């Protein structure tokens, strides 16, 4: 849903390449759920955090080599996919007795043998969006779902770019109030 967003990534990536770890943190926060979503298509849920972690570390280490030949997100996703797939290969080379163990370790033995559902969050977000005034709904919709820049949104809603900026902000603030608890 963007390209101008790529602009921010490039600026952040340039700083990380110079040694700025704070800038990397911003990128990780930006890409953490997207990367998890991608990784979760390939590995078992129990392994998703470890694979996501390894993907980000691999990306950080290889960042000297990102020349901006392609968009940073694409470069990062390829790394995450490869990281995930390698995990699947390792798992698919399990011995005979690894499945037998899983089977015998599965059932609880007498005696003794951070999380949220994304659909839950999505319901909250969309319910809030549906309750916003038309002006805010359209603004954040055009920006986040269609990927349109403020200039494009301005022409579409026939309003100043300053007004687009403010409308998107207020939509976000409204949603955050119901989400960020």
């Amino acid at each position: 849903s963007h390209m101008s967003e790529q602009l921010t990534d490039q600026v952040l990536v340039e700083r990380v390449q110079k040694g700025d770890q704070k800038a990397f943190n911003l990128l990780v926060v930006r890409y953490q759920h997207k990367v998890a979503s991608l990784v979760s298509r390939y590995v078992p849920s129990g392994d998703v955090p470890d694979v996501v972690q390894e993907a980000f570390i691999k990306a950080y280490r290889a960042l000297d080599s990102f020349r901006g030949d392609s968009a940073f997100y694409t470069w990062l996703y390829r790394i995450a996919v490869n990281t995930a797939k390698n995990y699947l290969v390792a798992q698919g080379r399990r011995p005979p007795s690894s499945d037998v163990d899983a089977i015998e370790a599965e059932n609880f033995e007498s005696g003794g043998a951070n999380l949220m559902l994304s659909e839950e969050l999505r319901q909250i977000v969309f319910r809030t969006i549906e309750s916003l005034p038309e002006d805010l709904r359209m603004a954040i919709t055009l920006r986040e779902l269609d990927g349109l820049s403020y200039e494009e949104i301005a022409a579409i809603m026939d309003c100043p770019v300053g007004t687009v900026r403010s409308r998107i902000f207020r939509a976000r603030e409204a949603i955050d109030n119901k989400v960020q608890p």
Binding site: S4, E5, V28, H33, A36, R122, F126, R165
Partner: protein
Amino acid sequence: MQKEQLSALMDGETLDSELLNELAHNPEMQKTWESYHLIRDSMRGDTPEVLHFDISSRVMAAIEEE
């Protein structure tokens, strides 16, 4: 820095280095960056089935040691 400026920054609509700096050094702005990106991911359907909220902290802790 105002949150409205943070909102513009995450949209690529300003690339001001002073703002990027303030963001990197302001805990409250960091929370907003995180929250607004969660909202974006939710809206775009860019989430796994189960969200984990400790990813970035785990990553950075691993970066600090290398």
